[PDB]
Amino acid sequence: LIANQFNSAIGKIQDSLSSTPSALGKLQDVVNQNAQALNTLVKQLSSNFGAISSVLNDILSRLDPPEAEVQIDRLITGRLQSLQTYVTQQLIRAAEIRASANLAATKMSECVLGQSKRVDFCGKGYHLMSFPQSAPHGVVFLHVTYVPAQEKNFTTAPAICHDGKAHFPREGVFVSNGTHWFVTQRNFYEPQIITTDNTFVSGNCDVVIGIVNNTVYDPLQPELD
Amino acid sequence: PVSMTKTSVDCTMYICGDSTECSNLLLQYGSFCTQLNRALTGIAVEQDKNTQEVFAQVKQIYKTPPIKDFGGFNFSQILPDPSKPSKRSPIEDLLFNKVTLADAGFIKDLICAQKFNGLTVLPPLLTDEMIAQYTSALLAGTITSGWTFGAGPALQIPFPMQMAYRFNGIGVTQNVLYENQKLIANQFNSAIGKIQDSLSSTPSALGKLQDVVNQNAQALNTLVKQLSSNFGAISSVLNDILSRLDPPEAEVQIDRLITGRLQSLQTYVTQQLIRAAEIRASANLAATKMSECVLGQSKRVDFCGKGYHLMSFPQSAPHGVVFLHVT
Amino acid sequence: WRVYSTGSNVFQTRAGCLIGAEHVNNSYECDIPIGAGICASYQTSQSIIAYTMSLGAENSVAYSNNSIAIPTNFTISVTTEIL
Ligand SMILES: *[C@@H]1O[C@H](CO)[C@@H](O[C@@H]2O[C@H](CO)[C@@H](O)[C@H](O)[C@H]2NC(C)=O)[C@H](O)[C@H]1NC(C)=O
Ligand SMILES: *[C@@H]1O[C@H](CO)[C@@H](O[C@@H]2O[C@H](CO)[C@@H](O)[C@H](O)[C@H]2NC(C)=O)[C@H](O)[C@H]1NC(C)=O
Ligand SMILES: *[C@@H]1O[C@H](CO)[C@@H](O[C@@H]2O[C@H](CO)[C@@H](O)[C@H](O)[C@H]2NC(C)=O)[C@H](O)[C@H]1NC(C)=O
Ligand SMILES: *[C@@H]1O[C@H](CO)[C@@H](O)[C@H](O)[C@H]1NC(C)=O
Ligand SMILES: *[C@@H]1O[C@H](CO)[C@@H](O)[C@H](O)[C@H]1NC(C)=O
Structure with a gap:
């Protein structure tokens, strides 16, 4: 049963990645932003900044030096400010x-090399294992988890009074079909x-509130008698 | 803290406020203002992403039953109170009244003086009435189902049996709880009441939130004050330079004013980016x-309060969250 | 431009004035965020609607002081996570 559920779930992962096109947006957006930054930087070369022209050789091929210096200084100031803006934003993105x-x-x-007990750190449910896969500039984890779903109600009690003694479960809980009592x-x-x-x-059994009266089978008494 | 105030700045009303000639001079600087609006819009989106990531952990809205026999425990100071216009718990009421919030930003002071120079405050996506609904859902799921509502379908369980499970987690055998239920109930109720009174008395408790608000207001304040500086021109008022001088000499003054004001905007945007990262x-x-503290039980030392962790309760606060760790 | 301001479906939100979108009484999950708890989407003969976003389905747990719920079957679930 678990083998069939596991193989089927991997196949649904296959088809869900094969069909939905907006899955990898967390990677894609990163690439987009970088290209966008470079694009803006390139078209900052076409701005005048107050000079006669945005082409440096047209200032050189037209003007004599004592005012070509004055226009070129303005162009240098603008382009240097563009570089500093780009470098600052690249530093902040690299930090992220x-x-x-x-x-x-x-x-x-923690998820791959071991088994985690932190809740919702390695997917939804109780974590079993994980497998990594590479992606262009990134990593993709497949978390295999255990989710319990078909529940019934039972009526419980914290303890059992048998012979004036309160018995507690070593591991589990006391439940009732409706008539009998079991440990689960x-x-x-x-x-x-x-x-x-x-x-x-x-x-x-006079201290615990909500204790119910029942009998506890001893495995030794039918062996002797 | 969880989020800060979403703020938007329009360049052309800030730099060249209501002028055509200054706009034509500003077009020679390329695309600085598109860059600034992109950066501030990115911050404003990321704030709503932060709040949605923190509070929206579950996708069903659980409700506590009207009967309140939790075995002696009394959650009345954290459960919502139906006798108020906003369905909040009284600890959340104290948390709302402690913080002296500024820059409210709803539709209509110093906020108007900021507003008339192209500075706007956007409203958050989630109101304060829906964050309280997520908080009430988290407490109802915790006290009626344990940790199982964060890992599948919610399964009900009596509360002292859940608390016995939680002692069994930290290495204390569960017969300790059932033989001392009244004592633990009294200690828990008294501790919640002392939290109520200690938060009601000490005024400097919420400084972690308050400082955030203060810093943002301070930044906006000095940005407005940078409109009053000459930068080497003959006046800080653009209309006076326009109303006195001819264009081929007023262009030189206006360019100097543009350079100074653009540098002020870039300084403000850089510091807002760094604070948004924090x-x-x-x-x-x-x-x-x-x-990890609320939806389950942690075993990391001093991650969820000092001592052996048992359980936790969230409460909302203006632009932040407050955890009560029961230990 | 003034060919939208005729309207007849104007709406007043705490974020401002919305023109060109009809307001419904339902509540869905959010599609395009507008603000103050208002989202908007494109649905039905198709139009643009604006609504108050819905947090999720209401559920009530049958709590009692001597009742537990125990699972009987389980599911193996594989999810992805991209970084
Ligand atoms: C309580 O649990 C017991 C488990 O044994 C159930 O009793 C059994 O019922 C079948 C008939 O359905 C009998 O053939 C068995 O002999 C019964 N067991 C015993 C030990 O007598 C019983 O059905 C459960 N109670 C309810 C209400 O379902
Ligand atoms: C849970 O604790 C609250 C503490 O506020 C109890 O409410 C108080 O009850 C006393 C007893 O009569 C009143 O004198 C106070 O005026 C109440 N205070 C408030 C703010 O309501 C409440 O009774 C406790 N719950 C139960 C079920 O006893
Ligand atoms: C537990 O659940 C699994 C499915 O999650 C059940 O397996 C299915 O059983 C039906 C029988 O009616 C078959 O037709 C299906 O093909 C089974 N599915 C798979 C994937 O094998 C299983 O029967 C359940 N067991 C109990 C005791 O409830
Ligand atoms: C839980 O099971 C009991 C039977 O013991 C039943 O009476 C009750 O209606 C059930 N509740 C739910 C929510 O299924
Ligand atoms: C549960 O509450 C009912 C109230 O109707 C009470 O009679 C019963 O003894 C309680 N059970 C426990 C275990 O406290």
Whole structure:
């Protein structure tokens, strides 16, 4: 069953990436912004900045030096300001990408090389494993997780009074079909008879509120009698 | 902190305020103003992305049942109160009244003096009435289902049995809780009440939020003051230079004023970009704490309060979030 | 331009004045963000509608002081994450 569900889920990942075109926008936007910045920088070469022309050789081929100096200084001031703007914005974007790369390194170390217990760090549900794949300028994780879904209701009680002693579950919880009482682990329904080997005794049964009266089967008494 | 104030600046009303000649001089500088509007619009989008990342963790709106037999625990100081026009908890009321918020920015002072020079404040996408609804959904899911609502379908469980599970997490055997339920109930209620009174008394508690607001206002303030500087021209008023001098000599003065005002805008935009990076780092930390302290139980030491962590409750605050860690 | 300002479907939001979009009484998930809890989308004979965005489906958990819900079956789910 788990083999079939796993293979089917990988196939749905295949088809969902093969059909939806806006999936990889987190990568794509990065590329777009970089190209956009360079584009603006190139068309800052066409601005006059107050000079006679935006072409430097037309200032050179027309004017004598004592005023060609004056126009060229204005052009230099404008173009240098454009470079400083571009470099500052590139520094800030590089800081953002470095933060994203540190997060990717943390996910690679913890989701892939081990099993994580942080909630919603390695996908939705209880985490089982992860597989990395490369992407152009980025990484793609496939998180394989466990999601429990078909629930029923039962009626519980925190303890069982048997012989003036309160019995508590070693691991799990006490549930009821409606008539009997069983011990069940907390994430999958499989009822078991309440024995001495999966409960522990603690005190008498006059302190705990909501304790229900039942019997606990001892595995030794039918062996002797 | 989670988000800051979305602000938009129009160049042409700031630099060449209501002038055609100054606009024609400004067109020779290329595309600075398209760049500035792109940067500020990017920040304004990222603020809403921060708030949506932090609070919108679940996609169903749970509701607490009207009966309140939680085994002795009393959540009345964090649950929403139906007897108020905005359905908020009283701790959220104190948090709203502590912060002296400025620059409200709804449709209609010093805010008007800022407004008349091309400075605008955009409203956030999520109002304060829907952030309270996410907060109420998170508390209802936590107190009626445990941690399972953040990992699948919500499964109900009695509250002292959930709290026994949480002692079983930190290495204390669960018979400790069931034999001391009244004591734990009294300690928990008294601790919540002391949180109420301590926040009601100390005035400097919320400085982490307040400083953020202050810094933003300060930046806007000095930007407005940079309109009053001469920069070497004969006046700081553009209409006087226009009303006195002929164009071939007034162009030289107006160019100097344009250079100074454009440098002021670039300084303001650079510092806003750096502050937005700081706030985004804080919002990512808040999202991590919401996913790991609230929706589950953490085992990282001192990540979710000092001591052995049991559970946590979120509350909203103006431009921020407040966690109560029960430990 | 004045060929839109005729309107007859003007709307007043806390973000400003919206012209050219009809207001509905439903609540959907957000498509294009406008502000103050108002989003807008393109739907039905097709038009542009503006609505109050909906946070999500309402759910009520049947809490009780002696009742638990336990799963019986499970699902293996594979999700992606791009960085
Ligand atoms: C309570 O659980 C018991 C589990 O044994 C169920 O009782 C069994 O019922 C079948 C008939 O459906 C009998 O053949 C078995 O002998 C019963 N078991 C015992 C130990 O007597 C019972 O159905 C459950 N209660 C309800 C209300 O479903
Ligand atoms: C939960 O705690 C609140 C604390 O505010 C209790 O409300 C107070 O109850 C006393 C008892 O009569 C009143 O004198 C106070 O005026 C109440 N204060 C408020 C603000 O309502 C509340 O009773 C507790 N819950 C339960 C179920 O007892
Ligand atoms: C648990 O769930 C799985 C599916 O999640 C069930 O498997 C299906 O069972 C039906 C039988 O009615 C088959 O027709 C399907 O082909 C099965 N699906 C797969 C993927 O194998 C399974 O029966 C459930 N088990 C219980 C005890 O409820
Ligand atoms: C839970 O199960 C009980 C049966 O013990 C039933 O009466 C109740 O209606 C169920 N509640 C829900 C929400 O399914
Ligand atoms: C649950 O509440 C009911 C109130 O109708 C009460 O009779 C019952 O004893 C309570 N059960 C527990 C375990 O506290």
